[PDB]
Amino acid sequence: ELAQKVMNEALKYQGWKYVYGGSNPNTSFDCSGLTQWCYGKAGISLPRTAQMQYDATQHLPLSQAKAGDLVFFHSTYNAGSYVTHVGIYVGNNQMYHAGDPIGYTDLSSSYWQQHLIGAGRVK
């Protein structure tokens, strides 16, 4: 149920431009702004940053992940925190994320595999 609620919201922003600092439809979204907003619509309260969201979830490999789990990554840009990116797992090795434009990407790629930290299940 969670996945369908989060993604019904997230799909409204498919193709939108990434905006740094964005956390609502009025501004558009950054990676963890998209997840915070969409999970919020589904009744889950998440913290604002990708790192904070990582630390609020229970972790599991991508092979065990289910749609509606989050997926986290390291070393995607020059950051103080270990976690540098988050997106939404939607099954079949795909994630939906911001992302520029916002939308789907395939996690099977070497790039995502090598930046992967793991998946996280929300509380």
Author numbering: 212 to 334
Paper passage:
Autolysins are peptidoglycan-degrading enzymes that generally reorganize the cell wall during cell division but kill bacteria by bacteriolysis when applied from outside the bacterial cell. Since the protein encoded by CD03720 has been designated as CdCwlT, the homologous protein encoded by CD33800 was herein named CdCwlT33800. Endopeptidase domains belong to the NlpC/P60 family, which cleave the γ-D-glutamyl-meso-diaminopimelic acid bond in peptidoglycans, are widely distributed among bacterial lineages, and are considered to play biologically significant roles.
There are two molecules, Mol-A and Mol-B, in an asymmetric unit, related by non-crystallographic twofold symmetry. The structures of the two molecules are almost identical within root-mean-square deviations of the main-chain atoms of 0.42 Å, and the structural description here concentrates on Mol-A, giving a relatively clear electron density to the whole polypeptide chain. CdCwlT33800CD2 was spherical with five helices and eight β-strands. A large β-sheet comprising six antiparallel β-strands (B3, B4, B5, B6, B7, and B8) was noted at the center of the molecule. An α-bundle-like structure with three helices (H1, H2, and H3) and a small β-sheet formed by B1 and B2 were located on one side of a large β-sheet, while two helices (H4 and H5) were present on the opposite side. A large substrate-binding groove was detected at the center of the molecule, and a large β-sheet formed the bottom of the groove. The B1–B2 and B6–B7 loops formed the sidewall of the substrate-binding groove, while the B4–B5 loop formed another sidewall. The electron density of the B4–B5 loop of Mol-A was poor, while that of Mol-B was invisible in the final electron density map, suggesting that the B4–B5 loop was in dynamic motion.
